[PDB]
PDB file of C-alpha atoms and ligand atoms in Angstrom:
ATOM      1  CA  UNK L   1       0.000   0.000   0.000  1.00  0.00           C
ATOM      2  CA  UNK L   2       1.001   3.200  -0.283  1.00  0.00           C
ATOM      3  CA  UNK L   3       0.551   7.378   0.850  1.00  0.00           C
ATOM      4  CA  UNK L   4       1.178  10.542  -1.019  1.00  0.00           C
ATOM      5  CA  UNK L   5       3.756  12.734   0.515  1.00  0.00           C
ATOM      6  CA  UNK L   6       3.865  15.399  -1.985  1.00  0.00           C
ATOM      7  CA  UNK L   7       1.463  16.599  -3.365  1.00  0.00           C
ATOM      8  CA  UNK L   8      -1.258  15.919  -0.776  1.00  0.00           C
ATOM      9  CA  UNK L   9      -3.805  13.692  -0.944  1.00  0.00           C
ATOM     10  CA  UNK L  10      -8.002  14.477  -1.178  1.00  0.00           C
ATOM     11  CA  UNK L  11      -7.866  13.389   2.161  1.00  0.00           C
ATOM     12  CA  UNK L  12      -6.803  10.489   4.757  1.00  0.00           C
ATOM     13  CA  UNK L  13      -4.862   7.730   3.915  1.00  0.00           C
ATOM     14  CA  UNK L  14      -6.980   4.497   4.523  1.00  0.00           C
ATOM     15  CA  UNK L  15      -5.474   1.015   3.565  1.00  0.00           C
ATOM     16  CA  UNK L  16      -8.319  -0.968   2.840  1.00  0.00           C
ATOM     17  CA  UNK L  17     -10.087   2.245   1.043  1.00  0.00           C
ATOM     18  CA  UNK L  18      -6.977   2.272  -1.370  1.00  0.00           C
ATOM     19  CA  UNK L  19      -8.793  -0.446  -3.969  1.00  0.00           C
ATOM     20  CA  UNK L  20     -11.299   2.470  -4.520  1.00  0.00           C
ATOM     21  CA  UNK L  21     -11.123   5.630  -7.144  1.00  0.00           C
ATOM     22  CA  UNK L  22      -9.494   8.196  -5.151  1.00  0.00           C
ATOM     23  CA  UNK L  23      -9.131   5.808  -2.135  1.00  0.00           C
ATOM     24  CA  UNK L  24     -13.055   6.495  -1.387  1.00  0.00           C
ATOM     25  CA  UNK L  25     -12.424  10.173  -1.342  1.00  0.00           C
ATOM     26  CA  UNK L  26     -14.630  10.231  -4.817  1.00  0.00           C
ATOM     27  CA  UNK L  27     -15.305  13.751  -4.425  1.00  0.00           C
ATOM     28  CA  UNK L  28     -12.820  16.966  -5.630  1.00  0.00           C
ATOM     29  CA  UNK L  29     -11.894  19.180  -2.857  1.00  0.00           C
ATOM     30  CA  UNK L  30     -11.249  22.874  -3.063  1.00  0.00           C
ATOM     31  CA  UNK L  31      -8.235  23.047  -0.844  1.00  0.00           C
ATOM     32  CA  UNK L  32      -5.967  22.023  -3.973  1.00  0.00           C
ATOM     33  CA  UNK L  33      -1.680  22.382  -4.035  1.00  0.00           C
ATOM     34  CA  UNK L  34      -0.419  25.062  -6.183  1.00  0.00           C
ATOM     35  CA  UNK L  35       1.316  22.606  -8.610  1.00  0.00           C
ATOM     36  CA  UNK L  36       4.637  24.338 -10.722  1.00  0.00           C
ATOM     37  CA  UNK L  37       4.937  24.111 -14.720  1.00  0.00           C
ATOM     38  CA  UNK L  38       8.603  25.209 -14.866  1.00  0.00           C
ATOM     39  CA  UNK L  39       9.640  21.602 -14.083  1.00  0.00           C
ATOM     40  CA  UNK L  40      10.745  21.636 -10.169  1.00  0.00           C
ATOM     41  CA  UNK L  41       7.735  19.566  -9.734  1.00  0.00           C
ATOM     42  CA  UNK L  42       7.266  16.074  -8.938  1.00  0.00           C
ATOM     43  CA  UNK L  43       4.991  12.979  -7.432  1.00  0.00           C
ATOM     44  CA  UNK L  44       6.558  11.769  -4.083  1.00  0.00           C
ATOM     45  CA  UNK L  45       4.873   8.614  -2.435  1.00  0.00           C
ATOM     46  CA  UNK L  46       6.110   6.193   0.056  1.00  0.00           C
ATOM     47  CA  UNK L  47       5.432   2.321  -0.382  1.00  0.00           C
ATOM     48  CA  UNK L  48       5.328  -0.022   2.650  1.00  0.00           C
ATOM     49  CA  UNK L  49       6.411  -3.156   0.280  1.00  0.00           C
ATOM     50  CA  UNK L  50       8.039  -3.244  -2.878  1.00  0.00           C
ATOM     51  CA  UNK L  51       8.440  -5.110  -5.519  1.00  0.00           C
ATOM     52  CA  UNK L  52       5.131  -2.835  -7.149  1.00  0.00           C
ATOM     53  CA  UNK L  53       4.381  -1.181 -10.467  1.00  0.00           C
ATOM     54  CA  UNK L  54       3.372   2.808 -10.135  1.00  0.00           C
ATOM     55  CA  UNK L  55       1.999   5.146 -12.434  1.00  0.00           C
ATOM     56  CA  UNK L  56      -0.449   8.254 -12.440  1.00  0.00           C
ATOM     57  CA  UNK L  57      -3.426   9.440 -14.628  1.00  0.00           C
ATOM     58  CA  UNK L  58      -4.751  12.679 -15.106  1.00  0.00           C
ATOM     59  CA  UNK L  59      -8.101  14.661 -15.097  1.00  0.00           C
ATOM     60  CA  UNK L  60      -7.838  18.410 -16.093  1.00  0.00           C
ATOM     61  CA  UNK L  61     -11.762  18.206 -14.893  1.00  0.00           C
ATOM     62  CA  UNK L  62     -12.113  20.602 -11.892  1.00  0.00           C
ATOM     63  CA  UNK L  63     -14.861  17.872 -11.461  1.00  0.00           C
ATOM     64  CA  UNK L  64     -12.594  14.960 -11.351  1.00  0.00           C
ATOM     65  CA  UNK L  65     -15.394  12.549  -9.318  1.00  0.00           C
ATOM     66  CA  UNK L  66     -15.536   9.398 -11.769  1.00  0.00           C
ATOM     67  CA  UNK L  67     -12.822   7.230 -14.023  1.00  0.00           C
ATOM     68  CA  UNK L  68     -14.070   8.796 -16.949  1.00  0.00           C
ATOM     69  CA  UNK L  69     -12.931  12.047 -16.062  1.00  0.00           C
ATOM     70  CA  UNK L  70      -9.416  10.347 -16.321  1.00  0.00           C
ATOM     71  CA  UNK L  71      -9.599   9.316 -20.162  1.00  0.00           C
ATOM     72  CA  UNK L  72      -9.196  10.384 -23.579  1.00  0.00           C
ATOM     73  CA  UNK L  73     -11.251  11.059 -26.826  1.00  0.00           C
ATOM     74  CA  UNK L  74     -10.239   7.445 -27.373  1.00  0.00           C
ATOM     75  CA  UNK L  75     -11.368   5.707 -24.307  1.00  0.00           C
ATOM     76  CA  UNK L  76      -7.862   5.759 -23.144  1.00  0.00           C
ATOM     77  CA  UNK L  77      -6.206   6.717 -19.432  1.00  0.00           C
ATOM     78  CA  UNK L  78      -4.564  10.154 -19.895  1.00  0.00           C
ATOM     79  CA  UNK L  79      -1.310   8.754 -18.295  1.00  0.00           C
ATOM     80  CA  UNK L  80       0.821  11.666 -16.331  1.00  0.00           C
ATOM     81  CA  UNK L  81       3.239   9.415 -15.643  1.00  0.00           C
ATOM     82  CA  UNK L  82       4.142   6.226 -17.097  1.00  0.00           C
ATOM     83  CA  UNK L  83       4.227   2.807 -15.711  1.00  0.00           C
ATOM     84  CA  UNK L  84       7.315   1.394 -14.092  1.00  0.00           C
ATOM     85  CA  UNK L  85       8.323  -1.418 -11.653  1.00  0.00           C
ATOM     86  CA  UNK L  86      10.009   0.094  -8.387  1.00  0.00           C
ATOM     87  CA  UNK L  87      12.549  -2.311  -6.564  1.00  0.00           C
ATOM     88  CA  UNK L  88      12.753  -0.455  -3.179  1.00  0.00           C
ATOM     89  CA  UNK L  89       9.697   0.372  -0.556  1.00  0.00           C
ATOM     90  CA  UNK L  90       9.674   3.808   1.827  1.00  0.00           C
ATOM     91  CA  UNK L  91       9.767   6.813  -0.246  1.00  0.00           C
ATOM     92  CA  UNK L  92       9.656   7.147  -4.548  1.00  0.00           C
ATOM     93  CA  UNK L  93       9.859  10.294  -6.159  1.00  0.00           C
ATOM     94  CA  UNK L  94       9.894  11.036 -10.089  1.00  0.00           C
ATOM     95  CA  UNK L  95       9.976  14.566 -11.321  1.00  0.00           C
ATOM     96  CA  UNK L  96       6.964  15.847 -13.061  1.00  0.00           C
ATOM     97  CA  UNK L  97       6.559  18.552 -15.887  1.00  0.00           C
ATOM     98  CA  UNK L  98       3.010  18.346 -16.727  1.00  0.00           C
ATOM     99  CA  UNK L  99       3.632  20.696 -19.891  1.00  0.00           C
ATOM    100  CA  UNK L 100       5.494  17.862 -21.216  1.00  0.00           C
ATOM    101  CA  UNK L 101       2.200  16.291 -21.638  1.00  0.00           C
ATOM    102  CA  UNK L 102       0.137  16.084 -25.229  1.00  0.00           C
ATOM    103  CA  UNK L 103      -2.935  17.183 -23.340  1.00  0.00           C
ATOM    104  CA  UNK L 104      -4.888  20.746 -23.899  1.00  0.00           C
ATOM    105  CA  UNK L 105      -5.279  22.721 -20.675  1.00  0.00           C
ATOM    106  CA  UNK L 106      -2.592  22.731 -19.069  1.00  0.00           C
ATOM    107  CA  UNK L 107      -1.602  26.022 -17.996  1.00  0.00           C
ATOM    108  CA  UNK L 108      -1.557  28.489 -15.762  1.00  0.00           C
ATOM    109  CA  UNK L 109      -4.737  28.261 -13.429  1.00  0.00           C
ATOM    110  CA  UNK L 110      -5.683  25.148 -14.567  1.00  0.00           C
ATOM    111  CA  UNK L 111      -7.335  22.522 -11.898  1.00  0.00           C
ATOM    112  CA  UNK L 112      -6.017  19.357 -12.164  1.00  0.00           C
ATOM    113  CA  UNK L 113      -6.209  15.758 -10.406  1.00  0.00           C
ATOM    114  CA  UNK L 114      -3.374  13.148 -10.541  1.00  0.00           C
ATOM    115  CA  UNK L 115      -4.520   9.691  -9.723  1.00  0.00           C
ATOM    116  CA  UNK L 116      -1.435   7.409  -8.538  1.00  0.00           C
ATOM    117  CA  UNK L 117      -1.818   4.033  -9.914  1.00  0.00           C
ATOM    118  CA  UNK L 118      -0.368   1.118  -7.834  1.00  0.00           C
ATOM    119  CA  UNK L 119      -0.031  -2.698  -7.232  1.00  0.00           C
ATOM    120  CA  UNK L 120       1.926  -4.573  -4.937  1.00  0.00           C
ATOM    121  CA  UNK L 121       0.524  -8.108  -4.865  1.00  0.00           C
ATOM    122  CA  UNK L 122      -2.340  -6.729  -2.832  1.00  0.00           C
ATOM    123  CA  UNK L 123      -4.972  -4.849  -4.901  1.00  0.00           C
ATOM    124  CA  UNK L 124      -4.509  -1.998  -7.572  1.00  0.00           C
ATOM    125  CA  UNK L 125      -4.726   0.981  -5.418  1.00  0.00           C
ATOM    126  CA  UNK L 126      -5.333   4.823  -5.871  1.00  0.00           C
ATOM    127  CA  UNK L 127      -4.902   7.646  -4.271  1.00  0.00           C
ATOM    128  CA  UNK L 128      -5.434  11.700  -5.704  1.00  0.00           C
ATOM    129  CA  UNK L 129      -3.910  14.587  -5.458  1.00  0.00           C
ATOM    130  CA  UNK L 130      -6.073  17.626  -6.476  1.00  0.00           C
ATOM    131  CA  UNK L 131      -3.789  20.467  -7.803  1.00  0.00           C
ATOM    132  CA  UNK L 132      -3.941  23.916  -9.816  1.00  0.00           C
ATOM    133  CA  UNK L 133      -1.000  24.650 -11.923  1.00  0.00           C
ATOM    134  CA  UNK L 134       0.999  27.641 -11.718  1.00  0.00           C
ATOM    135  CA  UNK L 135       3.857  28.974 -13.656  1.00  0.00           C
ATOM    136  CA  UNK L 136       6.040  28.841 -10.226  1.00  0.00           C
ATOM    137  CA  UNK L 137       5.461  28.108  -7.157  1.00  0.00           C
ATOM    138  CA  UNK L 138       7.344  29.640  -4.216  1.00  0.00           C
ATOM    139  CA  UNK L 139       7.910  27.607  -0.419  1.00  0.00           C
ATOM    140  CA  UNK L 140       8.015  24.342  -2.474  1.00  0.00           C
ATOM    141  CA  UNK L 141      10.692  22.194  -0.241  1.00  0.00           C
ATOM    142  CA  UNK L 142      12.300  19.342  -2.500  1.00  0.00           C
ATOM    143  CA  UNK L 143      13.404  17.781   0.472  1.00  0.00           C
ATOM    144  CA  UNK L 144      10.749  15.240   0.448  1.00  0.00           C
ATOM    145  CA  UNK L 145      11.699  14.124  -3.252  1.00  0.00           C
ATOM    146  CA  UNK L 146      13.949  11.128  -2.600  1.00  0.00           C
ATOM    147  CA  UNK L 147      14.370   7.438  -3.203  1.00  0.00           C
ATOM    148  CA  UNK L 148      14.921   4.923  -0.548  1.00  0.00           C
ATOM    149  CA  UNK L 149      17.258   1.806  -0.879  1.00  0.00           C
ATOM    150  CA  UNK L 150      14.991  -0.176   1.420  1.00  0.00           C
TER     151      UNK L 150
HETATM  152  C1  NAG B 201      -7.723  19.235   2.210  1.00  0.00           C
HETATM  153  O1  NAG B 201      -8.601  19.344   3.336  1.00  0.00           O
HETATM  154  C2  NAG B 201      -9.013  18.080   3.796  1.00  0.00           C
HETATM  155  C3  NAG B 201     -10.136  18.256   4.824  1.00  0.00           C
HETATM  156  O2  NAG B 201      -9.754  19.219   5.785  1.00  0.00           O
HETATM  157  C4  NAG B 201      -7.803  17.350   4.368  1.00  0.00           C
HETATM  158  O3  NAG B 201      -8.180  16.068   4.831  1.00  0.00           O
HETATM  159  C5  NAG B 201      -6.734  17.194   3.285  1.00  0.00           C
HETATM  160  O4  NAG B 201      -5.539  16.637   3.840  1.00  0.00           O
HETATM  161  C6  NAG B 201      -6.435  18.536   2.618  1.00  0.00           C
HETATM  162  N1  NAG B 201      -5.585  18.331   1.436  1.00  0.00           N
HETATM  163  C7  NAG B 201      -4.376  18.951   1.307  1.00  0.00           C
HETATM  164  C8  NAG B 201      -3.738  18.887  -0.075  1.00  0.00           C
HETATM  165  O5  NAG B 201      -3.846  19.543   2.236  1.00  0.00           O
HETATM  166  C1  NAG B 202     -20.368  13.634  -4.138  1.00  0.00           C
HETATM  167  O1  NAG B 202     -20.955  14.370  -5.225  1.00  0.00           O
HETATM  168  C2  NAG B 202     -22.040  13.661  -5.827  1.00  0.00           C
HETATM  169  C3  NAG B 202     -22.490  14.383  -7.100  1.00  0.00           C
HETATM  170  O2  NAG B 202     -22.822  15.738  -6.788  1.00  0.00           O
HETATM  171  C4  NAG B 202     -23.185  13.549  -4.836  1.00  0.00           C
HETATM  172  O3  NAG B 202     -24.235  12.745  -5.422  1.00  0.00           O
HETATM  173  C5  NAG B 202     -22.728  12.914  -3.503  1.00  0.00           C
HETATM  174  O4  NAG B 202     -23.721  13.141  -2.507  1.00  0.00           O
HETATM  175  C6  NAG B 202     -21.383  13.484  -3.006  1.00  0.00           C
HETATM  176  N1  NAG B 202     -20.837  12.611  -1.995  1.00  0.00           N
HETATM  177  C7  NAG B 202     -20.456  13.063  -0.807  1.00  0.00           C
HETATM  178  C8  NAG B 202     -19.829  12.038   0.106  1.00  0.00           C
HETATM  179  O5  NAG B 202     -20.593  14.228  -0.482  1.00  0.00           O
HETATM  180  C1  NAG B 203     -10.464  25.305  -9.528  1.00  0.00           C
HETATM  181  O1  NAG B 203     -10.637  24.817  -8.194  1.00  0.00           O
HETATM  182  C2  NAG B 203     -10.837  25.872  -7.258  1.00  0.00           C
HETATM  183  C3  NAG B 203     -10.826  25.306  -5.847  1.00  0.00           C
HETATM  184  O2  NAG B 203     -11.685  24.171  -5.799  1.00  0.00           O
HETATM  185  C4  NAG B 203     -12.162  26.580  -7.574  1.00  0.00           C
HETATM  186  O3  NAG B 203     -12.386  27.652  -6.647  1.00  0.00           O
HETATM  187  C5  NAG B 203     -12.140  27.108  -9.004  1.00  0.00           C
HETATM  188  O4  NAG B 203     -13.432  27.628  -9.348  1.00  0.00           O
HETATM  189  C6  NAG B 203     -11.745  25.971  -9.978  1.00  0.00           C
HETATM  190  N1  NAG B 203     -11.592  26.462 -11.341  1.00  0.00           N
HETATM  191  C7  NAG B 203     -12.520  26.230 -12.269  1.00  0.00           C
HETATM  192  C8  NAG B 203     -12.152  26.593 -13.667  1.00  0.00           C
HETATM  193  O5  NAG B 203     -13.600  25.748 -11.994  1.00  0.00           O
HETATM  194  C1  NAG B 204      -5.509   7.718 -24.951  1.00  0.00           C
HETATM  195  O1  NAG B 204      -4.618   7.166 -23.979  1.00  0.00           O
HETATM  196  C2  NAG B 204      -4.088   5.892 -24.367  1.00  0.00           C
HETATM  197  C3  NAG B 204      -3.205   5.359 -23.241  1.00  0.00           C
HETATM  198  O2  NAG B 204      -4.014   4.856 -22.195  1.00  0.00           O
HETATM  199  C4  NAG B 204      -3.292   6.031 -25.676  1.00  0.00           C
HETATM  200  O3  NAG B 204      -2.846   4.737 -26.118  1.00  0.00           O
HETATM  201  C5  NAG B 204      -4.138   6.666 -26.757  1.00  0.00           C
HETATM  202  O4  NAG B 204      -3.328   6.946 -27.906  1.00  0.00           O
HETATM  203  C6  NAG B 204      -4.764   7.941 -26.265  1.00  0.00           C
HETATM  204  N1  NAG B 204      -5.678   8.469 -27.278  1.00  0.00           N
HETATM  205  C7  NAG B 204      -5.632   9.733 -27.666  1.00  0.00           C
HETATM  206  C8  NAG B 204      -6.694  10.158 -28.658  1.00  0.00           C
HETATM  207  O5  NAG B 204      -4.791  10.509 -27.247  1.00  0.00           O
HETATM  208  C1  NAG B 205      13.870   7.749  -8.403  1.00  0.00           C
HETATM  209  O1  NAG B 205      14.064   6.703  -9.305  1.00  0.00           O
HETATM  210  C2  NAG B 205      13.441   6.936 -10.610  1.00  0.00           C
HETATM  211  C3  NAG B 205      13.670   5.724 -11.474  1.00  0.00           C
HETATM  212  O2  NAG B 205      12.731   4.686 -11.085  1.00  0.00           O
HETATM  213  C4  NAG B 205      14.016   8.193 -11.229  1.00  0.00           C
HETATM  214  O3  NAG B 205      13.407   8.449 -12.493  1.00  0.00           O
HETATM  215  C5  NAG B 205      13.799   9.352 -10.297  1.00  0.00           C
HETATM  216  O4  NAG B 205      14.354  10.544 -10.824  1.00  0.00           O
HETATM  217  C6  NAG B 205      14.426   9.051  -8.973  1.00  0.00           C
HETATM  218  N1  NAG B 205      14.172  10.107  -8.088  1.00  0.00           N
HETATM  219  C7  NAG B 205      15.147  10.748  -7.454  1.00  0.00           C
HETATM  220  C8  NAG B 205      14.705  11.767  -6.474  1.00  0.00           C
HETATM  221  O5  NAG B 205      16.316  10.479  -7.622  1.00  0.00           O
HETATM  222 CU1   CU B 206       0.094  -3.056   0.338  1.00  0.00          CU
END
């Protein structure tokens, strides 16, 4: 299972809630985390077991309350961050420049919610993180950004 670190969740962590969309929290908030588009950005979570694969859709819904709200024209996820196996549990952080993405909307003002995608053996699990990009972002402390060798 796993927790958000940065940027914060809808709401709670609660393990057994995780193999629902949003981790049960289905609902947006409106206490979102001013999210940077200059590239000092990133997804930091913290696993308590590893092997697991991670990745994270995207809604640029202010809405973002249903799966659908997560997918293409196509009928595809809008993936934010692709799929990969991660070797190590505690902490797992990958940078993330959402203007590298081939998605309209994305700019400055723009609500957003990233979905983390995750299975370890026990479930696929989700939590979100409901953001509004800005050009910069000031107090943003990188600190939490690391990967663990545990
Ligand atoms: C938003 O507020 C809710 C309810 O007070 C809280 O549980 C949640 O942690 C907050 N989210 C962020 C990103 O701080
Ligand atoms: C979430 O929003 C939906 C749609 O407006 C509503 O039907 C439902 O009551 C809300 N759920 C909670 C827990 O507030
Ligand atoms: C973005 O979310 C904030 C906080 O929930 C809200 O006040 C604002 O109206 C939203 N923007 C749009 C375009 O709806
Ligand atoms: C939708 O997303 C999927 C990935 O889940 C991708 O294969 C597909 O090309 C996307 N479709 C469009 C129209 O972007
Ligand atoms: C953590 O490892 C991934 C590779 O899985 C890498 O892309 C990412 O930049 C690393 N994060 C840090 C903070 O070194
Ligand atoms: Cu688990």
């Amino acid at each position: 299972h796993f927790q958000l670190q940065w940027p914060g969740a809808r709401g709670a962590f609660v393990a057994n809630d995780e193999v629902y969309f949003c981790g049960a929290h289905n609902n947006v908030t409106t206490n979102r985390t001013d999210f940077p588009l200059d590239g000092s950005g990133f997804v930091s979570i913290k696993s308590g077991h590893a092997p697991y694969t991670v990745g994270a859709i995207i809604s640029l819904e202010t809405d973002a309350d249903a799966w659908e709200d997560f997918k293409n024209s196509s009928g595809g996820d809008q993936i934010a961050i692709a799929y990969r196996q991660v070797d190590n549990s505690g902490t797992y952080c990958v940078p993330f420049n959402p203007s590298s993405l081939n998605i309209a909307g994305i700019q400055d003002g723009a609500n957003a919610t990233i979905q983390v995608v995750y299975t370890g053996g026990d479930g696929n699990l989700y939590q979100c993180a409901d953001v509004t990009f800005r050009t910069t972002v000031a107090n943003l402390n990188s600190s939490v950004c690391t990967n663990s060798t545990h």
